[PDB]
């Protein structure tokens, strides 16, 4: 943590391989105006003023996540390298037109971490283009005046993508570019999850992706964009296999 002026945050990293959250602190300076937006959120350029431990900011207590989902140790984490002092990165806030709940921010970040695991599994098949999903983290902006809630301003953060940002499929069956890898990845996740876990909303710059969406058959978890069986069917029905699907020996779909 740097002595330069900015604002403090409690920073949360989910680690799927131990299935726990890692709680840290950081300092950041975020530009006043967003540089981009989507349907539900605005994105802001931000600079990191360092990452620290959470020892100054005890929990007490019963908010989410529960204590048994929290790692008591935080020495290792991605944040300390990826959000080191001077890093430019992105902060995302929901637009008021506030169905956002605390739990929801953690679900979205966990989701992205789960997709990051699917990315690695895909890559281990040695496709022509490896993919990768960016880290994402929850941040409690503790210096800001609490919401109407009385519980702090929440946001999520992630590394800055540099380049032409494109969305390749939606979370409801749209195929928005001609690229193969994104669709073959979605398909891969559908077949290899035994249809239990489909990753769509494949978007980003080249093959560095962010803000995906998972569908699961029961619709539970993975945020509000989890359209369940319907999401899954809609993907698989508009999907036309390409060469990558074929290299991955996936069951051929004709669209
Ligand atoms: N990590 C990033 N780096 C750089 N630019 C980004 C990043 N994430 C998002 N953007 C840009 O910000 C816009 C809004 O992002 P995002 O909000 O994540 O997408 P979305 O699918 O519209 N759903 P929502 O999250 O509701 O907006 C995107 O369309 C991109 O132009
Ligand atoms: Zn396919």
Author numbering: 552 to 612, 615 to 650, 653 to 810
Reproduce passages from the article.
Dictyostelium myosin-II heavy chain kinase A (MHCK-A) phosphorylates the α-helical coiled-coil tail of myosin-II, causing contractile bipolar filaments of myosin-II to disassemble into inactive monomers. MHCK-A is a member of the atypical α-kinase family of serine/threonine protein kinases. The α-kinase domain is bi-lobed, with the active site located in a large cleft at the junction of the two lobes. The α-kinase N-lobe is similar to the N-lobe of other protein kinases but the C-lobe has a distinctive structure and requires a tightly bound zinc atom for stability.
Adenine binds into the far left-hand portion of the catalytic cleft, with the ribose moiety and phosphoryl groups extending towards the middle of the cleft. In all nucleotide-bound structures of A-CAT the left-hand side of the catalytic cleft is in a closed conformation with the P-loop clamped down over the adenine base, ribose moiety and phosphoryl groups. Hydrophobic interactions with the adenine base are made by Phe586 in the β5 strand and Val643 in the β7 strand. These two residues form part of a hydrophobic catalytic spine, comparable to that described in conventional protein kinases, that connects the N-lobe through the adenine base to the αD helix in the C-lobe. The invariant Lys645 residue in the β7 strand is also involved in binding the nucleotide through formation of a hydrogen bond with the adenine N2 atom.
